[PDB]
């Protein structure tokens, strides 16, 4: 015959979508918080900062 | 529930043409051949042809050509009998059968119109 | 849902791929296995066979199979199909190509149904294995424990997620079709298909639909009968022979698609602490290999992590700016030890 | 083929010897397991029982099975014939005492027929291991490879190259055929049956087809009668008594010989190959324990060989006069390595 014709591709699998490891690159950014202040006779009072 | 539902009972004249049909209800698959076959009155069945309502791939008897021709239409899901001169011999019972689709057989025919009846004589 | 299943049966149809070991030998199985997808936690796999499932000869019925005995789509009732991986799997569900199940770990995975006179096994050499959800290493979803976040193979008839090729199939091979009409080769169409002939010289590469007799070859062996057929599609597997249908890249939703679930994780027994000041012994009675690990919450976290699988007695050195353990699928612990009162400074 | 199982019925016949955990205790079952024989590679094992399967009681009729239930040989249609040693088997093909099956690793052989209201089962305590072929150890047979040449339990039918013997049935002990006619016991003869006695004191030690009765005493208990037949043979099995009378050394071929055969033997992925001039760097990601050997093309060979089974580097230094490394079944692969071009000499 001289033929036969395998054909092999790569592709995401159906379980791509669910567990996937992400490469993230990484920078300083910023930094925050959220504190809870109180003074005098207010009562406690939070808020992010 | 499925069904085959044809025209009415014809009256006609040997000479002139005539157009008969068989339409498909409660089945939403196009993947079915849809069969004609004739009862003489008295007498037993003689299948006429069958067409395939996907592609309108023909199936024919083969004592029937030009005399008799099968087409399809898909918006209706119906196949179309269309005889160009009648003959005397033409009076009869033709019957439309549904024979779904199983290998590269025709297979058996699962329900049934309840029968056209056209008598032509002069 | 049904309406996917009728999708379903627009154009595909069970086909005789190539299955190794049917039974005891490789053969062309109406059952085969391609593509078995066993990467659930807690044990399901999914199995892409050649025969259809639920689909029978004329509507859905889903105690219906349906697979092809030759030239012939037969349907028959789901009588008894079974899935071994190394003890009987207990299959979940079943849809067109695909069936659903829930296997035990081992080196094999092999269908089979009964047709009644016959079994009809295909056998394939997939090393499947179970992957316990947590840090405890549990062969078996346990009875209790604590729920957490696994991907399983969602037991939903249908979701449109994902997707898989329909193609033409391929002209099929044959010679029962060719017989000897008196001492010459014929060709006898099954009425319904265009069967195309190859023989001894150069023929009419295209077939007839009308039954044909060649003069060029007397006897069947220089002579055979590609079948084919244009009115139902197969799915474009990699043990069908390609045709000439190089069109129609149809779809297919995949019935069974990996979407998150909770899988209960077992609760190891706890541990035995014993704060003696300055450090921290933890005696460690597990029933499955379970992790331990441990970080200090200062400048230097001196990580430690290990897998325990017997009764065992580990200390830790707890200084005064603190110690966290966890242990199995309980959450972390901390433990901020120091004021011993050893000696006397007076 | 037809004259093999001619040639083992013109003698032969099923008994009952032994066979523990026949169920769940000891008994003597009709199918009494013996000379258990996994030797082949791809797991196939030939078994041997003292059932009679493949022949009827008047002819062959090959999907039959003739065994002993008590003191005649019934023939019964083969309903299910179920080996397992860990999971079920797939038997393949069975003769005259033999059965040849497929079955998986494990540590026991249990073999049984249905009868149709009883079972007949028997198992015994048999180490079986599948025995990879080649360099690579798979559990199971795959579908795609490298033919090796292994050795295997050949499934002809018919063969001549070995024999076991068959000898004259030893004495058949039996209590069921001593009734009392009045007040004495009365030995039975089953119309064909010589049948020996032996009472309280010494009685007649021969014999008579004649049914007896003897007034040594009133108990059946204190006299046994020997079931005796000179008309079908038995294989000398260790777990029945030997006949006083040592004549009939009797030839019966062995079905099933071992043969050389060609095993399909895995392929292991192909390996990274890091050529860093003055060395080699060599990335290896096996999916079974495959080995790796190398060794050097010079005057000392130098060799190494490790059994690989999980992703590892490997690196080999290759002089320049070359260095071989084949790495599980693949061909072997030649490197030679100088002239590297680090630093310059002006």
């Known amino acids: 015959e001289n033929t036969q014709m395998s054909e092999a591709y790569v592709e995401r699998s159906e379980e791509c979508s669910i567990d996937h490891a992400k490469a993230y690159k990484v920078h300083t950014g910023t930094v925050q918080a959220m504190v809870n202040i109180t003074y005098g006779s207010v009562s406690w009072r939070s808020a992010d900062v | 529930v499925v069904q085959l539902v044809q025209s009415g009972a014809e009256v006609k004249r040997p000479g002139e043409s005539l157009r008969i049909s068989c339409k498909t209800s409660?089945?939403?698959?196009?993947?079915?051949?849809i069969n004609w076959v004739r009862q003489r009155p008295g007498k037993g069945l003689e299948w006429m042809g069958s067409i395939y309502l996907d592609d309108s791939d023909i199936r024919f008897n083969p004592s029937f050509q030009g005399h008799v021709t099968i087409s399809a239409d898909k918006s209706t899901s119906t196949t179309y009998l269309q005889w160009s001169s009648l003959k005397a011999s033409d009076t009869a019972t033709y019957f439309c059968?549904?024979?779904?689709?199983?290998?590269?057989?025709?297979?058996?025919?699962?329900?049934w119109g309840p029968g056209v009846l056209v008598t032509v004589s002069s | 849902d049904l309406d996917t299943h009728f999708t379903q049966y627009k154009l595909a149809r069970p086909y005789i791929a190539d299955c190794p070991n049917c039974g005891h030998s490789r053969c062309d199985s109406p059952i085969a296995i391609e593509e078995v997808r066993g990467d659930a936690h807690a044990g399901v796999i999914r199995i892409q066979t050649s025969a259809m499932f639920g689909l029978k000869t004329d509507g859905v019925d889903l105690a219906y199979m349906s697979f092809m005995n030759g030239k012939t789509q037969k349907s028959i009732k789901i009588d008894n199909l079974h899935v071994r991986t190394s003890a009987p799997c207990s299959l979940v569900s079943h849809h067109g190509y695909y069936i659903l199940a829930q296997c035990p770990p081992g080196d094999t995975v092999t269908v089979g149904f009964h047709d009644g006179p016959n079994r009809h096994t295909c056998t394939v050499a997939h090393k499947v294995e179970f992957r316990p959800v947590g840090r405890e290493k549990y062969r078996h979803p346990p009875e209790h424990g604590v729920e957490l976040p696994c991907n399983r193979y969602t037991h939903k008839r249908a979701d449109q997620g994902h997707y898989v090729e329909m193609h033409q199939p391929g002209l099929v091979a044959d010679h029962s079709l060719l017989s000897i009409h008196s001492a010459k080769v014929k060709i006898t169409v099954p009425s319904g298909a265009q069967v195309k002939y190859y023989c001894k010289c150069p023929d009419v590469r295209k077939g007839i639909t009308s039954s044909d007799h060649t003069t060029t070859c007397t006897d069947v062996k220089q002579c055979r009968a590609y079948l084919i057929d244009n009115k139902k599609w197969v799915y474009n597997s990699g043990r069908l022979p390609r045709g000439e249908g190089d069109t129609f890249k149809g779809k297919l939703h995949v019935p069974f698609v990996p979407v998150k679930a909770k899988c209960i994780a077992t609760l190891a027994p706890e541990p035995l602490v014993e704060h003696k000041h300055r450090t921290l012994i933890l005696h460690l009675h597990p029933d499955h290999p379970t992790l331990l690990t441990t970080r200090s919450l200062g400048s230097d976290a001196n990580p430690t992590r290990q897998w325990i699988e017997r009764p065992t007695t580990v200390n830790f050195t707890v200084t005064g700016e603190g110690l966290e353990y966890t242990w199995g699928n309980h959450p972390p612990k901390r433990v901020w030890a120091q004021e011993s009162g050893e000696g006397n400074p007076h | 083929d037809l004259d093999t199982h001619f040639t083992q019925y013109k003698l032969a016949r099923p008994y009952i010897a032994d066979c523990p955990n026949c169920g769940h205790s000891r008994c003597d079952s009709p199918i009494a397991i013996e000379e258990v024989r996994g030797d082949a590679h791809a797991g196939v094992i030939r078994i041997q029982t003292s059932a009679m399967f493949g022949l009827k009681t008047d002819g062959v009729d090959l999907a039959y099975m003739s065994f002993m239930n008590g003191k005649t040989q019934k023939s019964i249609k083969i309903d299910n014939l179920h080996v397992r040693t860990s999971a079920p088997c797939s038997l393949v093909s069975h003769h005259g005492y033999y059965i040849l099956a497929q079955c998986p690793p494990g540590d026991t052989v249990t073999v049984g027929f249905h009868d149709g209201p009883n079972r007949h089962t028997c198992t015994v305590a048999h180490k079986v291991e599948f025995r990879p072929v080649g360099r690579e150890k798979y559990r199971h047979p795959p579908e795609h490879g490298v033919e090796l040449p292994c050795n295997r339990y050949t499934h002809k039918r018919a063969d001549q190259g070995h024999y076991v013997e068959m000898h004259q049935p030893g004495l058949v002990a039996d209590h069921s055929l001593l009734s009392i006619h009045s007040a004495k016991v009365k030995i039975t003869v089953p119309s064909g049956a010589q049948v020996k006695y032996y009472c309280k004191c010494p009685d007649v030690r021969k014999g008579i087809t004649s049914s007896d009765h003897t007034t040594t005493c009133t108990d059946v208990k204190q006299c046994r009668a020997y079931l005796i037949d000179n008309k079908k043979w038995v294989y000398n099995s260790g777990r029945l008594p030997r006949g006083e009378g040592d004549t009939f050394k009797g030839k019966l071929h062995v079905p099933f010989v071992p043969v050389k055969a060609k095993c399909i033997a895995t392929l292991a992925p192909e390996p990274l190959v890091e050529h860093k001039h003055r060395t080699l760097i060599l990335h290896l990601h096996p999916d079974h324990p495959t080995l790796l050997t190398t060794r050097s093309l010079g005057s000392d060979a130098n060799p190494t060989r490790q059994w690989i089974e999980r992703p590892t580097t490997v690196n080999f230094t290759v002089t320049g006069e070359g260095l071989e490394y084949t790495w599980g079944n693949h061909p072997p692969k030649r490197v030679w390595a100088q002239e590297s071009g680090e630093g310059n000499p002006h």
């Open positions: 059968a549904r024979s779904v689709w199983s290998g590269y057989y025709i297979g058996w025919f699962d329900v």
């Open positions: 409660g089945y939403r698959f196009t993947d079915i051949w």
